[PDB]
From a paper:
The regulatory cluster consists of three genes, aioX, aioS and aioR, which encode a periplasmic-binding protein (PBP), a sensor histidine kinase and a response regulator, respectively. Arsenite-bound AioX is thought to act as a ligand for AioS, the sensor histidine kinase that upon auto-phosphorylation, phosphorylates AioR, the response regulator, which binds to a conserved sequence upstream of a RpoN promoter. AioX exhibits a typical bilobed structure of the PBP type II class. In this class of proteins, the ligand-binding pocket is located in the space between the two domains.
The crystal structure of the phosphate-bound AioX was used to solve the structures of the apo and arsenite-bound forms of the protein by molecular replacement. Figure 5 shows the AioX ligand-binding site with arsenite forming a link to the sulphur atom of Cys106, confirming the role of this residue in arsenite binding. While the majority of both structures overlay very well, there is a significant difference in the rotamer conformation of Tyr88. The change in the side chain conformation is further associated with the backbone shift for residues 83–88 and a significant conformational change in the loop region comprising residues 53–61, demarked by the black circle in Fig. 5A. Interestingly, while the structures of apo-AioX and the phosphate-bound AioX contained a monomer in the asymmetric unit, the arsenite-bound molecule crystallised with six molecules in the asymmetric unit of the unit cell. Although the six molecules were arranged as the three repeats of a loosely associated dimer none of the interfaces is sufficiently large to be indicative of a biologically significant assembly. The arsenite-bound crystal structure of AioX showed significant conformational changes compared with the apo and phosphate-bound structures, specifically in the loop of residues 53–61 and the shape, as well as electrostatic potential, of the protein surface. It is possible that these modifications allow its interaction with the sensor histidine kinase, AioS, leading to its activation. AioX and ArxX bound arsenite with a Kd of 177 and 311 nM, respectively and no interaction was detected with any of the other substrates tested (data not shown).
Author numbering: 45 to 304
């Protein structure tokens, strides 16, 4: 009862599903006792600012923002998806597009998710950097959709010739929106990276709320609601991890910088 908790969301899952946004708020307030409010922004960077500055108690964010601000944030918990707390980046093209590999997308109009996304930018940036080109040199046009669901839409609709997307989001939409997703196919799958975690500011790690929150996430599979929420997100639940999960990502950040 003491007040109001601010919990941040990013489109690292289907945050358009208002139904889930509801159940989720429900499970959290019960588990935490106080009223929890879910926050969203237009971009990742915006959420990341609010989180670093402690304006949000915690937030569900991509692995890339977490490592970029590694020092100013700590892990709370990481989703489990199909057994393991990991995911891939999918480079997607049109279903009927006849092409072999990445190199054939030269000259595409390309949809990225967010300049701060691992699966929606960084991974593909790496593929470019290893070939000594940038997006402006390799693609005839590129743009940010500010969300993974949106990348898939862009490709499916024909607005983009190819796209870079969170593979979890793609595999979930393959079942919740199968006709859309069926207008795309996966051209390249990355290696496995740490699943987008929940996290909080480091100079407020020793906090009641985080602990209250860290708890809510691990025990989610133990409530009736929390089990409904998980079913919706197609996740097994949340586990504790350390920064070492996210090394694959930091090493890509390093490859991009060193290759530039």
């Amino acid at each position: 009862r003491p007040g109001v908790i601010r919990f941040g969301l990013t489109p690292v899952f289907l945050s358009n599903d208002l139904e889930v946004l509801d159940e989720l708020q429900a499970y959290l307030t019960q588990a935490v006792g106080q009223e929890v409010q879910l926050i969203t922004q237009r971009t990742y960077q915006e959420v990341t600012a609010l989180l670093v500055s402690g304006n949000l108690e915690a937030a569900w964010i991509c692995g890339y923002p977490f490592m970029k601000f590694r020092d100013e944030l700590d892990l709370v918990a990481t989703p489990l998806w199909r057994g393991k707390p990991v995911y891939q980046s999918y480079l997607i093209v049109g279903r009927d597009r006849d092409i072999a590999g990445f190199e054939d997308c030269q000259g595409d109009i390309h949809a990225f998710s967010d300049p701060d996304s691992n699966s929606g930018y960084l991974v593909t940036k790496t593929y470019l950097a290893e070939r000594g080109v940038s997006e402006e040199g390799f693609f005839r046009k590129s743009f940010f959709t500010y969300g993974h669901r949106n990348v898939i839409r862009a490709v499916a609709s024909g607005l983009a010739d190819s796209g870079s997307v969170d593979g979890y989001v793609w595999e979930v939409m393959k079942t919740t929106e199968p006709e859309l997703v069926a207008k795309t196919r996966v051209l390249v799958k990355s290696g496995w990276h740490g699943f987008p975690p929940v996290a909080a500011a480091a100079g407020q790690r020793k906090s009641q709320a985080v602990a209250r929150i860290r708890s809510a996430l691990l025990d989610m599979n133990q409530e009736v609601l929390g089990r409904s929420v998980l079913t919706r997100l197609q996740l097994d639940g949340f586990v504790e991890t350390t920064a070492e999960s996210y090394d694959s990502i930091a090493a890509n950040m390093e490859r991009v910088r060193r290759l530039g």
